[PDB]
């Protein structure tokens, strides 16, 4: 039901750059956004949840946002390890939908 | 400490069956949901089923609804994939996860996945 739309698909940057991504709802969906981070090889690994709650654990360079239907994770520094694919996801309503993935290349 | 071990995947043919498992540790998999989501290439993140193990109550994704069954065996903390009539298209990186808080923490554990490949 719910489209989450992700931008850009891809993106290129260099180890200490900031680099923003961005996911819109179709529809409302509160403050009920997660952000993952899949490295090549890996399982996803909760980043985010409620659009601006970073998951214990997790560093502190990656922020996320909400204005509205409009959701935005940041990576304030990027490091060498932060080469993965990002996705959102609402978690508001069945069934839980996810963005169609941003590939993080440095 | 909270983790998630899946197991079940490999090699099956088009129209054949395979069952994955989700093996829980650190927490019971009857205080929350599980679900499964794939990856397959090119089609990033798809959430598929899941299932509420107190009661078994199930939900599916359009794509696999009607071929693809959720159970779970609470006393063995693992819940199951039965999939059926295998395509193509279901070729994918499996992943099990839970959904932390009843979904307030979304899916805050995965299983590390397990590949099925329909050949």
């Known amino acids: 039901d719910i489209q989450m739309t992700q931008s850009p698909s891809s993106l290129s940057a260099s180890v200490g750059d900031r680099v923003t991504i961005t996911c819109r709802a179709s529809q409302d969906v509160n403050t009920a956004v997660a952000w993952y981070q899949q490295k090549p090889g890996k399982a996803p690994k909760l980043l985010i949840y409620?659009?601006?709650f970073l998951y214990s654990g997790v560093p502190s360079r990656f922020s996320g946002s909400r204005s509205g239907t409009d959701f935005t994770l940041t990576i304030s520094s990027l490091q060498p390890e932060d080469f993965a694919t990002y996705y959102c996801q609402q978690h508001y309503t069945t069934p839980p939908t996810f963005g169609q993935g941003t590939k993080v290349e440095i | 400490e909270v983790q998630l071990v899946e197991s079940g995947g490999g090699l099956v043919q088009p129209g054949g069956s395979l069952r994955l498992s989700c093996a829980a540790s650190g927490f019971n998999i009857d205080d929350t949901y599980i679900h499964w989501v794939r990856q397959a290439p090119g089609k990033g993140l798809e959430w598929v089923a899941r299932?509420?193990?107190?009661?078994?109550?199930?939900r599916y994704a359009d794509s696999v609804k009607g071929r693809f069954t959720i159970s779970a065996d609470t006393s063995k903390n693992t819940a199951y994939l039965q999939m059926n009539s295998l395509r193509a298209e279901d070729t994918a990186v499996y992943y099990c996860?839970?959904?932390?808080?009843?979904?307030?923490?979304?899916?805050?554990?995965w299983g590390q996945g397990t590949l099925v490949t329909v050949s």
């Open positions: 996860s839970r959904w932390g808080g009843d979904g307030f923490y979304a899916m805050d554990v």
């Open positions: 409620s659009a601006d």
């Open positions: 299932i509420y193990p107190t009661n078994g109550y199930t």
